[model samples]
Target chain A: HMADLSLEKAAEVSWEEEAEHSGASHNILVEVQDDGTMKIKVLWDTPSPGIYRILQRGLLGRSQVGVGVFQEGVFHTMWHVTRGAVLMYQGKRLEPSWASVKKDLISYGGGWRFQGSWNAGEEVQVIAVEPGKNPKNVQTAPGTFKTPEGEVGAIALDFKPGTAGSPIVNREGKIVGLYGNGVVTTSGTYVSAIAQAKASQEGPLPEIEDE
Target chain B: HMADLSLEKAAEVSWEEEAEHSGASHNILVEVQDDGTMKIKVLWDTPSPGIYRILQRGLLGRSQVGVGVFQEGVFHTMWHVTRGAVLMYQGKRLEPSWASVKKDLISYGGGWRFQGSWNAGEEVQVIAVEPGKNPKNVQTAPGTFKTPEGEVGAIALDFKPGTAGSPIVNREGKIVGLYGNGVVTTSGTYVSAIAQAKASQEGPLPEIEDE
Candidate 1:
């Protein structure tokens, strides 16, 4: 049953089971609009779009922005920001407020599943990271791969803490997974993140801007 | 009146008198290993030395590695990392732990100052940023800086947070100022950071490793 499910679904099951073990509340998933074909450069460790912004909410601190996965029809992000928080995209508001708040989960190579709404406004290019067929190591510098020093998963590399809910892409220039764990998360061998959000979640639904 | 004081001292005075009216903590002051003559590429907004790991240090979060400056010296970074916090340079640690932590002031395009110690151990070729003749504005994408329409300030280009202490360079490969108050700090008609630590800093305190 586990092997048959889509990578996203398997991770979701893993997330639920893991949550039950820790009694952590892993709720509030996200989604993206479909737009395809573009070049991607991993900024240090993130696969950022042409443009996006990190929004600030009072006690919740700052929330990171996530990208939309074209074919999957979902924009992925960790459910960490609370309801009514601001959602920004290129200087404009993505919505009236943040929809949910519940630190969520990361995929094991494959990405965690997400389903959320977004407005079509200034939502630049919609792209996705595809799963990899082989294990490859990434150099800390941009545009430098093919070295044997590292591989991507959750722990092997020291990706910064700010990129929750952002897409974890591959060198082939495609969306492959989702990454979160602002207390800190990893990219390879990480049993890291302990996984994503696990805490009570409550909030109003938010929307992505569509221009 | 502005021409004689040490860069650090001058900035400190500006912070104090300015705070008399605005209530900004232009207080913390930082120091560095003197040497500023190298071409710097602002990584998005943070001028990282590249090929290094930024360590975890609580909600204080992670700190970036800066270049040591000098033709003989080559790179420079902020005194931002806390003591015992790991210092990464070219994937290696000069200090196994972050050596110190104290708040400081940044130059004209004001930013908060930080302190981290560096010793000579496998010091790579350091690239530096120069002081600009006039402060400039930034664009959204990397490798581009034209006459931005909405007036100019180093921070106006929409730089991300945590760029505290990162050198704000102008269009012609020069250092114009620093970041403060996150994106809220304005640059037009502002006081820029000066090279105050230069005169008093012990030159080349000594190399840590041939090992």
Candidate 2:
């Protein structure tokens, strides 16, 4: 696994990176900024990876976009990712993506977690854990990661915007789903919590550890 | 990531798989029995995994362990695993281990997760979500798992032992930590939660998805 460490590189082409990621399965959707860059108005990328597996999946709050707007309800487990929870696909192992998290039970909002190497200005990273084939085992596996410092004990936190919401979007990006129980699309072609709607954000284990 | 998925294999030698996992930073642990099998009497395993990702980390119940004994309290993030969250060690893109989650700002237990192929009788699974360098970005990544079904919207849950607890243990299998605020070991050579302690288990977002 350490061999993959050499793969780290500067994100020279982020906007291009943006769309590929957006279409990946959807979590943090983005929009153009007046400044001429993607505003990432949606939940956006993680400051780092696998950060959520360890933290609590903050409960989400529903928005009353309008009285007449339609909203559908769905459970996090019913999504594409969590439903088929596994790291192996056609013999390929992969990292967890924002779309990967769409499977969670609750919605988002918590504190901003701090890692020694990550800077507030540096773009956030994604959840790096490899999902397992077994749904229950998915979380039972120890979430392992390595770092330059690899300090055994070294994280800090603060309750700030450090949290997020989702976007209920459609393929066009503009024709996004309206958030309610799940997502309500004006086009209604497809439905999801983050299609046009935006960010929000689970649970436990054995001879279990608690800090 | 898909390429790495080829490494999958049947767990012919599971007991051996047990300890390395236990010492590899701690999550579910095992024990011997009159039946002659290392009856892993602990919170055990997940039916399928990263199952906890989209699900909730149910609130934990504190075991009395006899009143007035010594129980120190701490947030989930202060431990070895959660504090220094990272997956790239000397250049590695590793999977998240149980220790990887110790950095979580909180504690454990929730419903057992289920994957399409995972039979409830099969040994449980572990969390598969990778951790990140930027602490704030931890939970933002979408947890992705694979399965034969790969169904887009497929997951189910219930209130069952599908949940777990922790052990406050030390290096020696015998002298473990006692549960409380964190782990309280009689041979408290080191102090941490789940050192010998046992089980238990947060927050919000905007334009959020709530179902």
Candidate 3:
């Protein structure tokens, strides 16, 4: 019965190979508003901090990633340092308010989950970046990660090369975490702590930038 | 939707006040075999570890706990030392084979997970050890414990006074560890290593006892 239910839940999520950047392709789910307005978000990281350019590629075609603003050094591990950002997609340069930015951090763990969601029973597919003779490999389905105490968390997804910036979805096709260089230290607490620390350090967006 | 599927799954698992030992009442799911034989297990330790005697208080109620043999000094934590034992339930003195004991250690994570068995999204109710007029206390649900890598394990469940040798189940209703006083080192590596060392030290359990 749970197996049947798991299959049913997974069917609701629609997935697509969104972008092909550098050497890998990314995956994403887009939510378009009925008002003919749209926003986009891509999961990725930082160095020179601030706002970095994001290219959105999916059903909307190739465009700039939007709907989120970058928070400097919001998450850091020995291997990666990531920042969160918000804005409207490429067609419009609609910047998110400072309040929205703070809200992102406040709900970072639950809100900003891009690749870590669902129970072990939920099976999710990983799209192949390199479309050879047969692409969209089914073998690369998401798996579970276990803690020291034997409890499991964050569905582990394998990505194609150059696919680091993409988002991983659950059975409901929801964004859990962005695809990273390799899966480690990508827990909600790590992401939330980074967002919290960055907000505490930077405070709010500048007045002129609010315009 | 995963939410709907989750709700359906939780409905399938029926819970009831299974046993009463000392002053505490416990919860359990008993699987009876067609051959007219049964086994019993309790979740306890890590939170309050010691050789606490458990009474077999379930279906064959009002009897001393039987079956499982406690290995002396088999498991050690920063705060306590525990022994492992195996056998059938009350009125039946079937001892588990030495090989089975070692196998239990090899697959300790899955083997140790006795009471915590459910798909993610199922809401389980924990029964209170000390129930007064407010019999179903809202706080009986198991809570979280953390690991150093920032991952979490175990849902701390309370048992009745003198109920030290019980098994602790997770949200899934599977066993995670034994309930003990003041949680300490109850990691997999520690438990596995001790079981291995005990196997080599004790060698094959005595021959006649094997019969």
Q: Give the number of the best model, judged by lDDT.
A: 3
Q: For candidate 3, lDDT tens digit of each residue in A1-211? A: 0000000000112354442222122244466898997765365533222212233222112221111212242321101111122222323332222222111122111222224354444444433222011223231233334323243323333332222223334445544433332222324111111111122233467655555
Cα lDDT tens digits for candidate 1, A1-211 = 0011111210111111111111112122245436654432123432222212233321112222222221222224433311122333334333221222222331211233332221112111112211211112222111111212232233223322233334433333333334343322232121222122122244598889798
Docking class of 1: incorrect
Q: In candidate 2, what are the lDDT values of residues A69-109, reduced to their tens digit?
A: 11121111111112122222123332332332222222112
Order the candidates by DockQ, highest first: 1, 2, 3
User: Which one wins on TM-score?
Assistant: 1
True contacts kept of each: 0.00, 0.00, 0.00
**Whole-model alpha-carbon lDDT for candidate 1:** 0.24
- Model 1, position B188, has a per-residue lDDT of 21
TM-score of chain B of 2: 0.17
Q: Please state the error at residue A121 of candidate 2 in Å.
A: 32
Query: Which candidate, 2 or 3, has the higher TM-score?
Result: 3
In order of appearance, the predictions have TM-scores of 0.25, 0.18, 0.21
- What value does the lDDT take at residue B164 in candidate 3? 28
User: What value of lDDT does candidate 3 attain over all alpha carbons?
Assistant: 0.25
Tens digit of lDDT per residue, candidate 3, span B1-211? 0000000000111134443232123344466889997765376532222222322221111222111113231321101111122222233332223222111221111122233332222223432222011122221233233333232223334332222223333444433333322221323110111111123333366545555
